[PDB]
Every structure is written in C-alpha cells, then in structure tokens.
RNA sequence: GUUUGACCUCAAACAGGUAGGAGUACCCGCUGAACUUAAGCAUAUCAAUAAGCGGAGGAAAAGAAACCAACCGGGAUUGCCUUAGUAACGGCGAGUGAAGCGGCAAAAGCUCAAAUUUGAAAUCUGGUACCUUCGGUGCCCGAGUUGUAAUUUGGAGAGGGCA
RNA sequence: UUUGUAAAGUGCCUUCGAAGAGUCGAGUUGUUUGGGAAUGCAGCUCUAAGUGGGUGGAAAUUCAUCUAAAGCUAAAUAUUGG
RNA sequence: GAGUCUAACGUCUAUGCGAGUGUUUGGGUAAACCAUACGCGUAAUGAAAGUGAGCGUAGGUUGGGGCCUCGCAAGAGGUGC
RNA sequence: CAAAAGUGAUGUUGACGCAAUGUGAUUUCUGCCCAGUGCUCGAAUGUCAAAGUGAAGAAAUUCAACCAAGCGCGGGUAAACG
RNA sequence: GUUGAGCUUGACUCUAGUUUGACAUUGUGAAGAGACAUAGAGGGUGUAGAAUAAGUGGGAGCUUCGGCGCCAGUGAAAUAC
C-alpha cells in the first residue's frame, strides 16, 4: 500500500503556516511575585485578537513600557476587558474574577482559565473560549495539590500554577453552532492539519487499511490496539467499552 | 617503576585511586564539548613512552567519540527486501576508536599534528582518549631525531592513511604468522 | 586538595620555604625531592601544595614517607623557588647539607611529622 | 556421611561401656544407612541379596529345613532340621510362625525345599523379614554356616533403609571399616546426586547411640 | 577589610614575510552499493571497488621481525620465472583458491629509554615584555648533559672509563 | 684542518645494567562464508606479566625459534597534461 | 554487415631429437647461441585405535619366513607392510 | 506523527478541546441475544533459562548441568466484530 | 513464459516497531519480613489388648524412685536398647 494519511502528520506542505504573524496567544508573563501594594500591575490597554485561539485577547501594561513597540504582554480575555479598571497579583492576592493568581491562594471550588499544570508553562488550560477548569484539591489533599481536569481524569500538582479567577469570555462555538463549512475552513489554517476527511471504507486498502470489499466494508478491524504500528493503528484507538 | 603513582594506576585502574578521580574527571568532562585541553598529561608515563618531552606546541587535547556502531539509517517504508542491511546498528569497521578521537581534534586544528592517544576511561555517554598533538613549527623538536620526521610535509594526516599506530590497523601490521599476505597494503594484496 | 593527608600551621609553612639560606645546601624540583630519600641525602622534604597536575605531588606524602624522612608541607610554589634563589617557581625542594640549623630544622620536620 | 570418622564411630563407641551400654552378650554390629531424597517408587528402591567380604555375622538361633541327607548333615553339625510335616506344624498355629521373625536369625532350607517356603513362611515375616540362603542337596551344612553370616538381606520395600548387619565384638575396628564402606557403596553411586542423598549415618552396634558422621 | 604571587582554564588590534586558482593518469584511506551466477532461489557471489568524499606526493606506497625451516639449515621490503588448482572453503553447486623451495634482477640500514619523577651554571625552546625597524635585552613553560640520584624487585651474566 | 666539535677504529686499565596497557585480548560481537577454524582485528564494556610474555590451524606436554603494544627509511615498479 | 586475430581439452597431420629428452626469465656472439631450476596423465581402503608404493604401478588367492606381547609356549592376535 | 540522534509538529488548542473512526439538518421512536471472535479488566492458581558420573597405575586425575511474565484460568463488555 | 509492477491472508520465513525482565555506568542509615546453615526443638490412630500401636533390622530392658510381642497372650501390623 501507499503512505497513510495519518504518518503526513509530523512534516508537510499542510503543516506550515503563519507564525511570526501571531502577535502573542495567550500565555502570561511577569506579573510580580509581591503584592507589596503591588509593583508589575496596571490596567488593560487593547482588545486584540490572536490567530490560532479563535477568540479575543487583549494587550495589559504594568509598571514597563507596553502600550505599542514592546512586543509580549497579552492579556486573557474576561468579560469585559476593557480600559480603566487594574488588574492585580502576588502570592497572597485579591480573589476577584479577571485577577491573575496562585491556585493556593484560593478555596476549594473555584472556577479558573488560562491555568499552568506541569511545573511552570506561563499558561496552559483554557485560553481561547469558553473553556475553564475546576481545582478542587486542597484541604484534605494535603501537600500536593489537584486540579481536577474537567472530564474525569488525573493530574498531580505539587505547587504549581497560577491563573485568572474565573470563566473565560466568548461561548458561542457550543452556545452559538456554525453555518457551513467554507466558514469552519477558517479554523483549519490557523492550525496546520488536513481537512475535511473522506470514509476510511470509501478509500482504498491501499491508501488506508479501513477499505476492502466490492461491497464496502471494513478490512482489518476497526478496533486497534496502543502499541501498534503507523498505518495498522487507525480507527478506534483501544475501544475499551463499546456503547 | 619508581612513577608507581601513575604507572600502578593506569594498568591498574581498578584500584581505588582511578575509579574515584575518573569519576570526578569524567564528571569535568560532561561540561566540556568535542575537543578540550588537558594541562600537562593525565597519564604522562605512557605520554612520554609515546613522545611527550614537552616545549609549547607539544599539546594535549582530550577528545570524544560516537555512539551506535557503523549507523547507517533506519528502515522506513520496506524492512526486508535482499537483507545485506536490516540493523541501524550493524557492521563495526577496522580502525579503532582512537582514530575517531583523533581526526575530530585533527581536522578542527590542522597545524596540530596526530601522534598517538591512549584511553583515559569513559562513562556511560562516549569513550575518551587523550590524543597528543605536535606542532611542525616548534624546533627543539625539530632538533631531536626522535620528532624531525613529523614535522616535515609527508607525515600531515597520519591517521588518514596508516602512519599512526590505529591506522596501522586499517591496512595489515601485527608481526605472526599471516603477515605474509597482508604484509604491505590491504589493497596490494586485495583483501586476502 | 586530596593531597593533603596529615598538614602543618600557616604561620610555620613560611619558615619552612626560607630553609634554604639558613642551611647549607638544598635541591629543588619534585623529582630531586623523590631522589633526595634512601641514604638520607634529603633531611626536610618541602612539599608544596599547589603544583599542577595534582598526580606530580601525590608522589611526596607516599613515597618519602615508606623509606622515610621526616617531610614536612610549605605552604606554597610561588615563594618556595624565589626563597631558594634558582630561576624559577619551584615545584618542590629539599634540605641536603646542614650548615647551622639542625636544632633549629628538627622543629620544621618534627612539627608536622 | 563422611569416610573421615568411619573408623572412629566404630572405635570410641565399642570401646567403652559409658556410650554403648554392654549387656551378657556379644553385641552384632550393623550399619544401616539414611536415604534422604529417595522416593519409594520404581527407580530409587534397591532390593537384591549380596554380601559384604568379610561376612556381616549374624547366627544365633539357626534353624535348617531338609530331607534325607541334609537332616543327617544337619544334626552332624549340631542344629536342629525340621522336614516337611515340621513346616507345617509352627504354620497350623498363631505363636510359632510369628515367633519363627523372632530369635530365629539365620535360615537354611535345602534345594527342592526352598520353594516351598515363600507359600506358607512368608507374610509373617513382612517386617524382620528372615528368608533361608541358597543351599543344595549336595552342599555341606558346616561350610554353610559361614554362608548364612555373609548372605544377608537387602530390602528397600515400604521404607528407605536397608539394613545389613557389618560384624560384631569378633571383628576389630578395621575389619569393620571394609564393611561399612562396602554397605553404601552399593545404594549410593548408582542413582546421581550421590552423598548429598545418603543422609547422616551412625554404626549402631546393639546398644549403641549416635555417633553421626 | 587589606597587601602581595606562581599553574590549570585560557584573548583582541597595529605592524616583515607567505598564499589562493587552472588540469589528466598513477596510489593510500573512508561512508560503501548493484545489474549477475548455481539457468530460478533471502546467507556462496558482482565487493571493499564503482559513484561520492577524504588523504599524501613526484613517484605513490611498503618494510628490517612477538619470521620460516625442522635438529640438516637459513635470515628485510619489492618485481619476475618455477609454483598451484596442490594444500582448503562453498546446496562441495557456479565460483574463489595460498604457503614453502630453487633460480634470475637490484639489494644499504637506522630513530626511541634503567622506564620516568625532571631542572641549573651554560647550552637552549615555544610563546611573549621592554627597547621600540628582525638588532639588542628579559621572564616563565622546558630538553639532556649537569647541580644530583632512586623506586618496586632480582642476578653472574656482562659492561664502562681513559688515551 | 685532525678541525679546540660530533662519531668510528686501535690500545690499555678497572668494574658490572632495562622495559612501552587499553594493548596482551575478554562476557559477548565483529573487520573474517565460524565451521574444530590460525591470523588479519577491537563495536558495548572491562581488563595481564618481563629467568616473564608471544609466533608454529585442538589439549596435556616437550623441543627448536622470536621479544610488540612509539617511530623511520633507496631501488627492481605504476602512470600522463606538454 | 551476420561463426570470428582469444584460448582449454581430446583424436590426428608434420617433426628437430628420444629410454632420458626438451626448456624459461636472462645472459647476448642478438631474431642466432648458451643455460637445464623443474615438469611430463600421479595412490587403494576401514562410524573414531599406520603407511608413502620404483614418472603413477594396484586387485584376487596362497606358501614360506622374520619380529614383538599376554598366558601353562594349552593357545590366541597383527606383522600377508 | 516525523527524524539514525540532536530537535519539532500535535500546541502560545486543552475536554466548553484536540484527533482518528462511525455519521449527517428535520421530526416521532427504539424490542431482543454471551455461542464464536476482538478490545478491556481481574488474581484464586498452573507451565517455561543456573547437576555431577568417568581415565595417573604390571587394573589407584579434574571440571562446564531449572526458574519469571503474557499464556492456562477467571472476570468485565456487544456504536469492535458476530 | 519455472514473465514484470501495483497489491493481499491468523500460510511460512523474518524485521523496523511493540512489550516484559536482567546487568554496567551510579553513594549512604533504620525499621519490618523471609531463606540457608542448623546450636536447639515437635506435630498421631480401626478394634481387641494390663495400655495411647507408622517405620527398619540386629535380636532381648522386668528397676541405685518407674515392664507387657524374653516367657506368656491379644491383633491387621507387636517389645526394649
């Protein structure tokens, strides 16, 4: 057979697009540790949208040169970012919706965007639209901490991460559906990936090993396991329960 | 003999002086990069049992090596076929690792010319030898016979044809029984 | 260093450099000291600490110590040599003949040692 | 079991009067072994009817079992013959035949009677387990005294010992040592692993305790 | 604080000389295949070479014993004639296939240590300071004589000085 | 000129000397068709002695023979752009 | 322009010279002449316990005789190379 | 998922999502099955790699050969195949 | 055609991959739980029989505090040491 569509995933023409274009997704950066009364915090400046996340952002100054020329500081996008009101930080902070703080420092049950995970990565989870997460891991959890990730799942914290209080502006991807496709088209050049699709049983066993039959069907399995090879292992991924 | 304080050590590195400092010296090692030089000899017994009656321009430099054997790449898309080559860590070759470490410090400085090397043990990342370098310029050496011959044209690149003692090796020189065949060149004979 | 196995004070490691005008003769180099030792030509061995590579000294506390005189450490190279009076920064030296200084030498060995 | 004490475990324990505790008779020496890792089964169960070189002593009470010439031979001797009615005659009752595993020890039985015996004298003599030699019609019964000394018995059967008697107070503490040696060389080298099989074993003399080697 | 120095690691600008490239064949080394044959057949085999890249020179390139003979005897490398399809290997199938001995040509031999641990009068060196123009002056790294011997151990074989 | 310096021959007196370890090769592989398979030869990793070690296609054993692990060297010869 | 200037084996033509002959590199009187290293159809055969066959020379069957060992020279086994 | 390895896409997206597969807005609804096979889950209990017998004297030396998992067995499950 | 390529299955040969275990590179204290070597140490039934019966063979324990296969008897099997 032919090469899989799935192994054209790691190089490719598809996989190249703009980069440098994209003003700052929505990570955060220097914000001050204090909290003294305060020494890298300020206001919000712009309402800027960045490619990739399919959402607004916004542009924040603090106690450094930020309005134009200096090219970093972005903002997550609460409603209603906006100029005139300041944002604030430290360790032991405000706990207000649209503050950028410790998960520590809030109780149990708080709702939070644009949160780190592993030991430091500026920001992680939830950062486009709609998106939020929920720590509920303090109090009987005692030294380590828990954010417990929205489907059902893990993930050990030991201290950890900072983010916005809150749940992030937009909603209207889920709360509001689409149209047609040519206008969906617009996600899938802001990410690199191929697009739409075609049946795995419409398309040959050569090009995909999910054909086979003069009456269509599927030819290997449909259910393949984890430790398996590039183009053995399509379909469902370890279907562990049917239905 | 009365040096048994290098000499005891470095045929003996078992000992408990060796695997304590190698440790720490391999550890000085993980800080530095392809070529790094080296003061006066680790081992300067057998240093100067090779050539090492010093002057400046009689260098040292410790060098490391590869790992994998003789890679070559992995195989994508087929794995059969005729099957010469399956591995991607498959033949070895003639020379020894001494020649690797060698030509890496040969090449980068061409006027420093190869001697010989000796092994100053290893860890779990590459091998390191101590190659000693000449210099063709720097006389004193060029008035002792033992040094004249290296530094005058024909004796650049001893490794790359077989001059030096590992490329010796790549050719047909160990004094037995089957010298008689491969007495002179591998291709005067023609790999018999 | 690891060199240094048994040591001697800061104050008295000076003293031990300038013996050289106040015996007689003295032999400098870290191979004379090795020399220095069977028929008992060295008397004080002058170990300096700080000669490089460090495989050079490690010879002194060893050797010089199993046929045996009584050594006793300098406290450096840099005023070892120039306190002799030769050309260079010797890395080591030795007292051979004694001019007046034995009473007053047996309390730069036999300090340390 | 050890060829360093096998003469010293005959000789201390023999010796004195304080170890083994001397009775008015002269005390039978044997040597039984010690079979560990043996599984009573088909392979590791010895069984035969072979002798030691220097006779492993055993007499006491002998009986004969003849007719014609060998009852004549028999008595010449000075032991008593039974015949055939005589064989039945301890079978018939519960005390004789049993008491016949007693202090009867040593057995003759002439050539056509031998075969006779294994018929009625036979599950009582299960446990001690007394059997008469092979002796003809045409053989001396006074040079077959030494011949029931040196045939002796060897039977794994239900345990995994086979006793065999070595000599007695008659032999010396040499003698005994090419007795002892012969009774395990016999089990030992014909099923591999060997001496790590063959346990601890001591020469018990009658009333003889351990003097384990 | 503060006063005075040696080796490891290990720089940048002025200013005599010195050099680039165009080219063929010959050789050594390295990443290093294959069309093919046993009518085919994955491991015999095209083969350590092509092709590509690296290295040395005017010749390249080799070599003076950790050798053969076989108790009779001899003594480097290299080329040629005898040799050898012998002695072995491979579905013992294509195929591949030495050594020793005699003769001919042209045949001379040498650099390193009691290892090394290495330091000064002087010899004497790589780098480098002052003088500031290759001439004069100075220090450290250092090579053996030498100032002067050991270390770890041993023998009756044999060497060295002086003229 | 005996060259105020370097070597040899000749002749005399007096007296006693050595060794190069990542190599020898090794658990295992291999540059070698590993087959009982020398040698050439050292990937991953470690690793040996100078009255002692090594070559000679199995080993115990015996006889003849050589002394590495640093290094250099003329010709018989190969070939062309002019 | 379509069976051929390589080159091996085997009958045979011609043939200096033959029970010993004929070489080669090369020398050199130079296509001559001299030298004679050395070849010339070439070893049976026993799963594991030797001999070396006259260019190469064996097989089948049998008599005589030399040598060694064990054991009671009762007799058994090779020597038949 | 690419690459010999360094190094990255996936991705400054994050489950309110990323992707492979099944699919198709609308509107009323959805009965039944554990033999056979896959994926997933579970521990009562069964199997698989490190002995030692033999040669120095007219018949009396030495050293190289059993333990784990998947499996068996037991438990969960049919928008994975049936 | 003992044809070529694309291209296939739990046939079979084999490999990148995948998965589990072991060793080197690579140091240092307590508490709790096993194995071997064993100084030492023990868990049992069919009836009759004085009485609480697995062996094995030599063949003989009736007392300086104290028996029941000597003798004599019961039993499927019958002392001691």
Redesign the interface.
């Given at each position: 057979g032919r090469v899989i569509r799935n192994q054209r995933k790691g190089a490719g023409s598809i996989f190249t697009s703009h980069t440098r274009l994209r003003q700052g997704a929505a990570k955060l950066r220097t914000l001050d540790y204090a909290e003294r009364h305060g020494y890298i915090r300020g206001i919000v400046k712009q309402i800027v949208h960045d490619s990739g996340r399919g959402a607004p952002l916004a542009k924040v100054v603090f106690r450094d040169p930020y309005k134009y020329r200096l090219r970093e500081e972005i903002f997550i996008a609460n409603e209603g970012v906006h100029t005139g009101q300041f944002i604030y930080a430290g360790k032991k902070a405000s706990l207000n919706v649209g503050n950028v703080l410790p998960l520590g420092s809030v109780p149990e049950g708080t709702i939070v965007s644009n949160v780190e995970e592993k030991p430091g990565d500026r920001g992680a989870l939830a950062r486009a639209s709609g998106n939020y997460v929920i720590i509920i891991g303090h109090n009987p959890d005692e030294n380590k901490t828990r954010v417990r990730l929205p489907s059902g799942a893990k993930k050990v914290i030991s201290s950890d991460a900072r983010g916005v209080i809150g749940v992030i502006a937009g909603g209207g991807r889920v709360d509001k559906p689409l149209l047609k496709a040519g206008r969906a088209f617009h996600k899938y050049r802001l990410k690199r990936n191929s697009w739409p699709k075609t049946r795995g049983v419409a398309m040959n066993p050569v090009d995909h090993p999910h054909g086979g039959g003069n009456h269509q069907h599927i030819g290997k399995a449909s259910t393949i396991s984890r430790g398996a090879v590039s183009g053995q292992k399509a379909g469902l991924i370890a279907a562990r329960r049917t239905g | 003999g009365?040096?048994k304080?290098?000499e005891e050590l470095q045929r003996k590195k078992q000992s408990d002086v060796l695997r304590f400092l190698q440790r720490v010296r391999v550890w000085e090692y993980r800080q530095k990069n392809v070529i790094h030089r080296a003061?006066?000899?680790?081992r300067?017994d057998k240093a100067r049992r090779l050539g090492y009656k010093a002057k400046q321009g009689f260098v040292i430099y410790r060098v490391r090596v590869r790992r994998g054997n003789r890679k070559r790449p992995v195989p994508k898309g087929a794995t059969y076929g005729k099957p010469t080559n399956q591995g991607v860590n498959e033949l070895k070759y003639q020379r020894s690792l001494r020649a690797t470490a060698e030509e890496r410090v040969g090449r980068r400085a061409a006027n420093l010319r190869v001697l010989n090397s000796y092994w100053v043990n290893q860890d779990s990342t590459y091998k390191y030898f101590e190659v000693i370098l000449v210099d063709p310029q720097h006389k004193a050496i060029r008035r002792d016979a033992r040094y004249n011959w290296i530094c005058d044209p024909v004796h650049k690149h001893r490794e790359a044809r077989g001059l030096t003692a590992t490329g010796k090796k790549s050719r047909g020189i160990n004094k037995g029984h089957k010298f008689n065949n491969t007495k002179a060149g591998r291709r005067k004979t023609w790999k018999r | 260093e690891r060199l240094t196995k048994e040591a001697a004070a800061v104050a008295e490691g000076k003293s031990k450099q300038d013996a050289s005008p106040k015996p007689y003769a003295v032999k400098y180099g870290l191979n004379h000291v090795?020399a220095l030792i069977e028929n008992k030509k060295a008397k004080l061995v002058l170990i300096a600490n700080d000669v490089?590579?460090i495989?050079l000294v490690?010879?002194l506390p060893?050797?010089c110590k199993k046929m045996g005189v009584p050594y006793a450490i300098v406290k450096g190279k840099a005023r070892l040599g120039t306190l002799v009076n030769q050309k260079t920064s010797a890395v080591a030296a030795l007292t051979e003949v004694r001019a007046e200084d034995e009473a007053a030498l047996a309390k730069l060995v036999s300090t340390i040692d | 079991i050890t060829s360093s004490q096998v003469r010293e475990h005959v000789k201390e324990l023999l010796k004195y009067s304080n170890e083994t505790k001397k009775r008015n008779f002269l005390e039978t020496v044997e040597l039984q072994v010690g079979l560990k890792n043996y599984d009573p089964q088909r392979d590791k169960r010895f069984s035969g009817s072979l002798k030691l070189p220097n006779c492993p002593r055993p007499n006491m009470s002998i009986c004969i079992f003849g007719d014609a010439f060998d009852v004549d031979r028999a008595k010449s001797c000075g032991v008593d013959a039974m015949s055939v009615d005589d064989l039945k005659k301890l079978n018939k009752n519960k005390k004789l035949i049993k008491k016949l595993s007693k202090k009867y020890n040593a057995f003759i039985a002439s050539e056509v009677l031998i075969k006779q015996v294994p018929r009625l004298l036979g599950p009582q003599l299960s446990k001690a387990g007394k059997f008469p030699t092979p002796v003809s019609h045409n053989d001396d019964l006074y040079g077959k005294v030494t011949d029931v000394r040196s045939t002796i018995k060897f039977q794994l059967k239900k345990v995994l010992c086979l006793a065999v008697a070595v000599g007695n107070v008659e032999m010396e503490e040499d003698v005994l040592v090419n007795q002892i040696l012969m009774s395990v060389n016999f089990f030992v080298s014909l099923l591999k692993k060997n001496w790590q099989n063959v346990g601890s074993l001591v020469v018990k003399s009658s009333m003889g305790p351990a003097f384990r080697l």
């Open positions: - | 009365a040096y304080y290098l003061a006066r000899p680790t300067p | 090795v490089d590579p495989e490690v010879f060893a050797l | -």
